[PDB]
């Protein structure tokens, strides 16, 4: 028992982290097979990040403009033999295939999904933590200068799913990056200019999962016979900055295990959003929306 | 910017996870140099875990009673050549040194310290998370049956400090294990009996660190001219289930960087413990005491003008 924010073991990803340098800019990259992926702003001098012309910056480069170093494990300088730009990423081709390339996929996560982040600096992994893609397609992580190129991933059945490459900090504690097709989460542009973030929302399905976790951890004071139907709840959610509830098998597994219906949990959300009134749930006095149904299922007795 | 619960990258520890089998019991273990460590209850049949006689169970074993296997990552061919019982651990000697042994040391953490946990099942690393040793020498983790042998560690300056090997669940969301000298944190026994946990306390120095992190993340509404001296605060803490505040260089770094004194933060704790008055700090409505001053400095300290 217990419920904690849990990340996927990072070793398979650590074996793929490299450092990339272009002029005076250095950041992290991901080395899979003969490819190294990194943010394209490595091409932009630090004092020109306000409105770069990446097409023009790309034309001025050659393969010799990029230096790649494997810093951890068996150290090696990897020779760049080709380069191209894919959205907000550079795709470098190196002469050596990573001998520790894991089985992997590239996926783009949807708002409400969780993933692990391996924070890196100068091609050295320094920390692991878990985030959720917010309703406005940002993440609430912990990143400092030099973290660009840090990798977000999940793991299942021995396969690493690479979902994020860190690109920038939008505002305090708010970050974004790209999927490995080079598309930025939230369509933010990789430039220093002020960019508006859309309004965020509480992820209903995740709050429901968390309330089921609370019941399975002996906290059930908030469960009442009271029900709110999904259609009615969804009309309320549209006015109270909550997401629409759409049923899933993972939630149905928790409803069946606990004997508490989804409609009872939706009624609990409405009551708890008005206030907890001097009470706590799993030590919290506010709703938690960053655990997914699958994340909760992983931490409950089978 | 931002402040999140951060764990040390786990790869160096993942390379050391093995499985040990004795009879019908298979547990996770840790392979370092020519040694494999695992919980001593591997010697106990599953239906006899209530109150085992470990001295009697040990006498019935030989080196051939134990099998060590590594079916994940780089596989290995291991033979047990010696065995002994060290507190609540079995210490096996194997014929092959782990070729991926990191530079390491063994340490016992004190209450208030944080560490990373690599949760393992069936010899497979499954999850990473960070805990703090509570005032009552328990941890508040997330573990299910089969997680014994899971490893707690820290990393700094290229050295892995191995601090914990998981053993048991004391009560809901409350766990304990041993350091690698085989001593159980909190002196709990590896038997299925009712065992009383001492009362916990909020770790003051960690709450102070968190409040400095909040200031460095733009949250400062709770800072007032009000101060509470350390001696006065400590007398209050003895009555309100908070730990004594003892000054440290890591906290002084945060006081200097923010210009907010420790005494202002101790006054904020007293006020916030009475209640947050409908406001939040870093998204929370309750005090956070599981980030140490050094953990905060990793996420917030930058260049300092001298
Ligand atoms: Ni950058
Ligand atoms: Ni066990």
UniProtKB/Swiss-Prot annotation, chain A:
The Peptidase C30 domain is annotated at 1-302
Q: Which residues form the active site?
A: 41 (for 3cl-pro activity), 148 (for 3cl-pro activity)
Question: Which reaction does this chain catalyze?
Answer: TSAVLQ-|-SGFRK-NH2 and SGVTFQ-|-GKFKK the two peptides corresponding to the two self-cleavage sites of the SARS 3C-like proteinase are the two most reactive peptide substrates. The enzyme exhibits a strong preference for substrates containing Gln at P1 position and Leu at P2 position
What's the superkingdom here?
Answer: Viruses
General function of this protein:
Responsible for the majority of cleavages as it cleaves the C-terminus of replicase polyprotein at 11 sites. Recognizes substrates containing the core sequence [ILMVF]-Q-|-[SGACN]. Inhibited by the substrate-analog Cbz-Val-Asn-Ser-Thr-Leu-Gln-CMK. Also contains an ADP-ribose-1''-phosphate (ADRP)-binding function.
Q: What is this protein called?
A: 3C-like proteinase nsp5
Species the sequence originates in: Bat coronavirus HKU4 (BtCoV)
Lineage, broadest ranks: Viruses, Riboviria, Orthornavirae, Pisuviricota, Pisoniviricetes
**What is the covered span of the full protein?**
3292 to 3593 of 4434
